[PDB]
Amino acid sequence: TPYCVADYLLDRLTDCGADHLFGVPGDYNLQFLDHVIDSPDICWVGCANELNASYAADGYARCKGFAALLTTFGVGELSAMNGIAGSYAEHVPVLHIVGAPGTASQQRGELLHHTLGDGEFRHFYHMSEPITVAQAILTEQNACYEIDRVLTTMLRERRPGYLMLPADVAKKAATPPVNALTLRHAHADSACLKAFRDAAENRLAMSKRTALLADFLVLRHGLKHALQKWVKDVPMAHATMLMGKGIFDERHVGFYGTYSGSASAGAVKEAIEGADTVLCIGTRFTDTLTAGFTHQLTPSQTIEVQPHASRVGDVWFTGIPMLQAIETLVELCKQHVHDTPVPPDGSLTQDNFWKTLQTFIRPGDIILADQGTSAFGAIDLRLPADVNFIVQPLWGSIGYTLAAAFGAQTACPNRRVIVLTGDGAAQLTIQELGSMLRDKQHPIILVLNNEGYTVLRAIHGPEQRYNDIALWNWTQIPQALSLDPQAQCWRVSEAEQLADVLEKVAHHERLSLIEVMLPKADIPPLLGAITKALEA
Amino acid sequence: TPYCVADYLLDRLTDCGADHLFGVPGDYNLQFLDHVIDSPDICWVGCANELNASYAADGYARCKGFAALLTTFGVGELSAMNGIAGSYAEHVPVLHIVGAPGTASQQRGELLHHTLGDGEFRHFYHMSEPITVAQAILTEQNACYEIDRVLTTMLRERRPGYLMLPADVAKKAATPPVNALTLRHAHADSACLKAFRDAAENRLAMSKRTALLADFLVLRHGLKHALQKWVKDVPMAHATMLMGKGIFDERHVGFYGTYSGSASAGAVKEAIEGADTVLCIGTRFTDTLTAGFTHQLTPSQTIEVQPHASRVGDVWFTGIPMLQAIETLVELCKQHVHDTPVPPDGSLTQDNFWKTLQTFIRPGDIILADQGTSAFGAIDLRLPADVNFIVQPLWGSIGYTLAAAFGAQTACPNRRVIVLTGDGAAQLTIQELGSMLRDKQHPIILVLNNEGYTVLRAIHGPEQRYNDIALWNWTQIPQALSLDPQAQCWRVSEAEQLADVLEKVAHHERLSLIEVMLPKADIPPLLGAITKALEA
Ligand SMILES: Cc1ncc(C[n+]2csc(CCOP(=O)(O)OP(=O)(O)O)c2C)c(N)n1
Ligand SMILES: Cc1ncc(C[n+]2csc(CCOP(=O)(O)OP(=O)(O)O)c2C)c(N)n1
Ligand SMILES: O=C(O)C(=O)Cc1ccccc1
Ligand SMILES: O=C(O)C(=O)Cc1ccccc1
Ligand SMILES: [Mg+2]
Ligand SMILES: [Mg+2]
């Protein structure tokens, strides 16, 4: 077992922050997998299918800052394509490793399984190009520096990378690196940073009341502490949108709720949109996050910070890392901003479900909500400290949440994971519940059983049959997907029942599946406003 | 509800042979779905996820000659990418309809859900290019003739097509066609056909023993009957490979078993490879079908017929329809082939499982086997007449078989569907069993429970844990995926038990799940030949 390219890739994987490898085996990656098994730093996590494996890696990377997925050539990598695209859309650094046929087999154009039968072995590599920031076909002549380049770009951009690893390449000799891969910090040209600073100070110095709006790019680049630190030194009205929920302790002074554009609570609208200067840190104003682009923030009202560029008014200042832009704004805010922010009983409904769940969440929770009433209702939760809130509203792929929960629980085995998934969403990735059971995880899974696609019903054709789903027996699923499930399940239809059951499960001693019976047409407040804005 | 582009697409869809549309709804395709619901000719089939929906359409198209899949922009189409690629690889005409945001939203580059957040709406259209034979972005200015062009190319090439249907384009006015969409058989230039006939006539005239080898491309282009009649009218040693199994009634004289390169029964090798002239009709010599490319067929020994070109010896004759080449060769065989033929108890094992199943299959059966010991064992079955044998050994995506069975059973509600899936494979697409139960289908599902990836174990690392799987309670799955599964399930470990159970479920009055307990290391004969031809 001499040190080879496969070992080099695994060593670089640990350098980037991953302690587990998700995926599904195939004959093209079995020999690479031997090095994963033997590795003392990387844990193989076999998944029920590649799409779930890619979802799990995404959720894993949202907890550890990095993740890796292993698939087999063609059938595996294409199954995971939607997950990688979601990681690209929401800036999640998931490394897609594709085990591939040997280079000699590729060069002869053989009619191998997992190919289109045309002897071409680069179709799927090119198909991955739009959803990755870097990729490489690893050869004997490029492997180690291509691995470093892709991972480095992945770390810089916080977005997926792709490596095609032919089985013969994996075995090629390599030498262990003396230093851990860490390309680290970049600094703006001091004149460029000074110009930004000067422009931001002029704007901030003339601001009567400043507000702060941070979102998911703060999370992805590891600036959550800095933003928390920011609001503590510099009290001001602050909020996130749905994607970046969890950046702030929502019980802190100056926080009035999540910002949603026009769908926002009245206090939130006044706190953020009423400020003459709003600092938008890592924000993307997507249709869902702004309830149909109904946000009212003018360019002259805002200072914007993006990963490599920041904007003051109409002027953009490019080639500035967001970290330096934030440090600049923090210093400036300490000088020029002086605001002192002034502070169950019946049939289950969306309203009393979320109120009941609000009393249940605790610090340290990992909360995942899928698209549908789960995410659009969970936006109203008042998150305590140290909560990792995982939602995917830009990509919006239902089924992500259940499989991502498995990755998150793998990342943080000692943290309580709460899964908020619709009945429709859970059908798409249900087989990863077996992975949770196999690995003895103890998530609290709440299935919002409204018997179909309620969000779709609220958008169009509520009585149409395409909005119906096959009606599953949810409390029986753990017993079918495990020979001895360490789990308990309940079906609740009353608010007192749910609160009583949530009381029972509180310290998550086993996996909990709570089937929540909800009305077919019941809608959380945010989604009602999103539907109200969909008309023309 | 005036007639519009959406109705035109559905009208053309029925013309091509699809009576059902598979997929998953999304807000971008709800209004088109109203036309599917309202249509009296096409039935909406909601699926548990898009990947299973694409698998189901593939199996549906293998029974009706055409199929359609409907997904939503981005999250849906990318989830279905592996299914479409498999349809492209094995020449299955599946139409992928992608409901998309309105053109105005696309033109403004809005930050819409199901996008990468870059305002780009053509990434996923271009990613589908390598795995479709034709595509179009439907506009108000091109919709109807782009629809016709894509379907016509699909009909000609027997391969998937792609249509992006912006929600606004679907509502644009159209006129119902007086002529049903059809693609009239091409005709070879009479000199080119004559040149091939004269070269083939010379080749056959000096051949003492001729054998016939047909495979899946015969099935896709609708030449099954032609090959059947050809061997009836001219008896000769004939065979198929694994992909084209089912072309022949395997009980007629001159059929000795499926051809698998070096892995043949002695009679099959002598029947096919021993012939001085072998007619290869629609054959692709992939690694799995040839047991590692160990087939011995020389160019001078073979006459080969492909969809648009045929070969005699070293000379290719292009621009000849496959039908005309066969017709020509049928004429010639009558002229120059003047010849005729040549001359369960105890613990369940792979050997006695397939022996037991051999006595169970009947005419009219639709048999689907997934990659693994299921497909590699089912190759030894001697099929009776009118059997549709669905295997996917070129693409080889496990999980296809279970979801494809749902599509096939939808296609043929009055035929008995036998599903041969491994435990590993069935985990990937298990949620489509709920679709089977919701639609009151009655397949006989045999899950080969060898507790993990046995074929992978036989290839590499039998004791390695990446070849293990989560151990499910298979007979309990219908009770979890339905509120009233009228299903009958058994766990069998004895052959006498299995035969008794197979007698019980023979007339498929209910869905049957037979969990077949097989040894972890038990191997079908073909896979042993595939393993021995590796790293040699
Ligand atoms: C993979 C995928 N397919 C389709 C969609 C379209 N879509 C968006 S919300 C939704 C319904 C979700 O329903 P459910 O999970 O039951 O949530 P509910 O609103 O009913 O609470 C669908 C199908 C998607 N987002 N992702
Ligand atoms: C979607 C997909 N993922 C991974 C593979 C790689 N692969 C090929 S055969 C196989 C084993 C299949 O196991 P099972 O379905 O239980 O059949 P068995 O060979 O175990 O009888 C695997 C993992 C594949 N072919 N398709
Ligand atoms: O291992 C894989 O990638 C498979 O898909 C299973 C397999 C193994 C050997 C030949 C064909 C398929
Ligand atoms: O319908 C879809 O495509 C969805 O993904 C659900 C949805 C509906 C409205 C806003 C965001 C997501
Ligand atoms: Mg629902
Ligand atoms: Mg198995």
Side-chain angles (χ1 to χ4, degrees), chain A residues 25-26 50 75 114, chain B residues 372-373 396-398 422-425 428 450 452-456:
Chain A
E50 287 90 357
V75 292
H114 307 340
Chain B
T373 69
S397 192
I398 80 172
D423 47 343
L428 276 82
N450 38 34
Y453 303 133
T454 282
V455 54
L456 292 192

Side-chain angles (χ1 to χ4, degrees), chain A residues 208-495:
Chain A
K208 306 301 234 320
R209 178 166 82 76
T210 307
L212 185 89
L213 181 68
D215 209 77
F216 75 103
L217 290 170
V218 165
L219 295 172
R220 309 294 202 263
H221 288 266
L223 283 288
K224 183 200 208 282
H225 174 39
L227 269 287
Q228 288 169 174
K229 193 41 186 102
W230 194 346
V231 292
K232 142 184 162 212
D233 301 5
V234 196
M236 47 188 158
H238 53 296
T240 77
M241 293 179 283
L242 178 55
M243 287 191 71
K245 192 190 248 293
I247 290 160
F248 297 137
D249 191 340
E250 314 202 325
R251 319 160 291 183
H252 201 129
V253 61
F255 194 93
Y256 306 80
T258 300
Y259 180 65
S260 68
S262 72
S264 313
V268 180
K269 205 165 331 183
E270 175 74 354
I272 304 309
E273 286 183 356
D276 59 53
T277 302
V278 176
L279 313 180
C280 306
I281 312 305
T283 48
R284 299 304 164 80
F285 293 102
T286 81
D287 59 341
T288 294
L289 265 56
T290 54
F293 303 117
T294 57
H295 56 302
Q296 309 201 228
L297 298 155
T298 76
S300 97
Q301 184 189 14
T302 41
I303 291 180
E304 200 189 330
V305 170
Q306 294 298 337
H308 309 295
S310 295
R311 168 185 63 76
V312 179
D314 307 296
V315 179
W316 275 95
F317 301 84
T318 81
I320 291 167
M322 81 176 311
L323 168 56
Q324 280 179 301
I326 283 159
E327 290 172 339
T328 290
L329 287 182
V330 167
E331 205 172 2
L332 291 176
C333 280
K334 290 160 171 188
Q335 171 167 7
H336 301 277
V337 78
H338 282 285
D339 318 318
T340 28
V342 135
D345 65 342
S347 257
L348 273 175
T349 63
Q350 289 278 330
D351 184 284
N352 63 37
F353 168 81
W354 294 112
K355 281 192 216 293
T356 295
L357 188 77
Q358 169 68 41
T359 76
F360 174 81
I361 65 187
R362 297 276 181 284
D365 273 348
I366 295 163
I367 301 173
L368 309 92
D370 217 331
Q371 301 298 294
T373 66
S374 283
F376 305 157
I379 197 191
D380 289 306
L381 289 171
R382 202 158 160 108
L383 296 198
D386 202 6
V387 169
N388 189 337
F389 187 93
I390 290 171
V391 76
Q392 192 197 56
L394 170 59
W395 192 232
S397 185
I398 58 160
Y400 162 89
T401 287
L402 175 69
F406 172 69
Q409 188 74 92
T410 304
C412 317
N414 298 321
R415 286 179 72 170
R416 190 175 72 163
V417 171
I418 299 156
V419 194
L420 299 160
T421 176
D423 50 355
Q427 294 194 341
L428 276 80
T429 56
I430 190 64
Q431 48 267 95
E432 225 55 26
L433 182 36
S435 301
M436 307 177 156
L437 293 166
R438 174 203 64 194
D439 294 349
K440 316 142 307 213
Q441 308 194 329
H442 306 322
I444 296 129
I445 303 174
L446 295 116
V447 180
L448 294 212
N449 185 350
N450 39 33
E451 305 203 309
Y453 301 136
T454 282
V455 47
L456 291 192
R457 289 189 201 283
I459 290 154
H460 185 76
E463 300 196 79
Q464 288 282 55
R465 150 178 92 80
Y466 52 73
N467 287 332
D468 298 326
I469 62 176
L471 289 182
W472 286 9
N473 196 6
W474 291 99
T475 62
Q476 276 327 110
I477 300 206
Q479 286 97 324
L481 295 194
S482 159
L483 288 181
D484 178 23
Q486 1 58 59
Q488 212 177 151
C489 328
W490 296 261
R491 173 178 16 96
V492 307
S493 65
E494 319 303 309

Side-chain angles (χ1 to χ4, degrees), chain A residues 24-28 30-31 33-34 37-38 42-52 55 73-76 78-79 81-82 85-86 88-91 110-118 123-124 126-128 130-131 159 171 284-288 293 392-398 424 426-432 434-435 438 451 453 455-457 459-461 464-474 476-477 479-484 534, chain B residues 24-28 30-31 33-34 37-38 43-52 55 73-76 78-79 81-82 85-86 88-91 110-118 123-124 126-128 130-131 159 284-288 293 392-398 424 426-432 434-435 438 451 453 456-457 459-461 464-474 476-484 515 534-535:
Chain A
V24 174
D27 69 330
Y28 297 138
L30 294 191
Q31 258 143 357
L33 268 177
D34 287 332
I37 290 319
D38 284 341
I42 291 288
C43 175
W44 175 240
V45 185
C47 284
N49 64 36
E50 287 90 357
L51 178 60
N52 296 7
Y55 287 157
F73 182 90
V75 292
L78 289 191
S79 289
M81 171 150 298
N82 183 48
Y88 187 91
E90 312 231 331
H91 293 238
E110 305 187 322
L111 298 195
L112 299 188
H113 59 284
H114 307 340
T115 73
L116 307 181
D118 57 0
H123 284 126
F124 321 128
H126 292 125
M127 280 152 84
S128 271
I131 61 175
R159 270 186 147 152
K171 308 213 257 203
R284 299 304 164 80
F285 293 102
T286 81
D287 59 341
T288 294
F293 303 117
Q392 192 197 56
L394 170 59
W395 192 232
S397 185
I398 58 160
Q427 294 194 341
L428 276 80
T429 56
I430 190 64
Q431 48 267 95
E432 225 55 26
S435 301
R438 174 203 64 194
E451 305 203 309
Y453 301 136
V455 47
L456 291 192
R457 289 189 201 283
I459 290 154
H460 185 76
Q464 288 282 55
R465 150 178 92 80
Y466 52 73
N467 287 332
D468 298 326
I469 62 176
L471 289 182
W472 286 9
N473 196 6
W474 291 99
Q476 276 327 110
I477 300 206
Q479 286 97 324
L481 295 194
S482 159
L483 288 181
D484 178 23
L534 259 179
Chain B
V24 172
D27 69 317
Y28 298 136
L30 295 179
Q31 296 178 119
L33 268 166
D34 290 341
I37 298 314
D38 286 351
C43 181
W44 170 247
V45 182
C47 284
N49 62 38
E50 287 90 1
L51 184 58
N52 303 355
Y55 286 159
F73 182 84
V75 291
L78 290 185
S79 293
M81 210 75 137
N82 186 52
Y88 182 92
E90 315 225 336
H91 296 239
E110 312 198 328
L111 294 170
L112 296 186
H113 62 275
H114 305 338
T115 80
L116 306 184
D118 54 3
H123 286 318
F124 323 131
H126 289 133
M127 290 160 72
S128 290
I131 70 177
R159 265 182 150 153
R284 294 306 162 79
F285 288 81
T286 86
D287 58 354
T288 287
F293 304 119
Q392 194 200 49
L394 169 53
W395 190 237
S397 192
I398 80 172
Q427 297 193 331
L428 276 82
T429 59
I430 194 47
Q431 50 270 100
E432 223 56 25
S435 309
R438 176 204 59 202
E451 317 205 307
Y453 303 133
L456 292 192
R457 291 187 199 281
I459 293 170
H460 190 66
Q464 286 288 71
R465 90 167 161 89
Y466 52 73
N467 281 334
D468 296 334
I469 62 183
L471 296 187
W472 289 4
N473 204 346
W474 290 100
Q476 301 309 299
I477 300 191
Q479 290 95 307
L481 300 191
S482 173
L483 283 204
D484 181 19
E515 186 177 6
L534 256 170
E535 287 146 347

Side-chain angles (χ1 to χ4, degrees), chain B residues 297-341 343-421:
Chain B
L297 289 173
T298 86
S300 35
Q301 183 193 11
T302 42
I303 282 161
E304 163 174 22
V305 172
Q306 294 296 341
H308 305 289
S310 293
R311 173 185 61 74
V312 177
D314 293 311
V315 177
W316 276 93
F317 304 86
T318 73
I320 287 154
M322 186 175 205
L323 167 61
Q324 270 182 330
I326 286 162
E327 284 176 349
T328 299
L329 292 174
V330 175
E331 291 160 1
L332 304 185
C333 280
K334 301 203 201 147
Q335 181 183 151
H336 304 284
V337 170
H338 345 253
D339 250 290
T340 229
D345 80 323
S347 74
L348 274 170
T349 60
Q350 288 277 340
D351 187 278
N352 61 48
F353 171 76
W354 294 114
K355 264 165 181 54
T356 299
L357 192 92
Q358 174 58 46
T359 71
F360 171 73
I361 57 175
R362 293 286 185 287
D365 274 346
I366 302 181
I367 305 168
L368 312 90
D370 222 318
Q371 289 319 281
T373 69
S374 281
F376 305 160
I379 198 167
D380 297 319
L381 287 177
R382 194 138 140 115
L383 309 185
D386 202 30
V387 171
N388 190 348
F389 185 93
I390 293 173
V391 66
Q392 194 200 49
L394 169 53
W395 190 237
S397 192
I398 80 172
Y400 161 87
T401 293
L402 181 67
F406 172 67
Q409 186 75 92
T410 300
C412 310
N414 295 317
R415 296 185 65 180
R416 184 172 82 173
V417 170
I418 298 157
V419 191
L420 297 151
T421 178

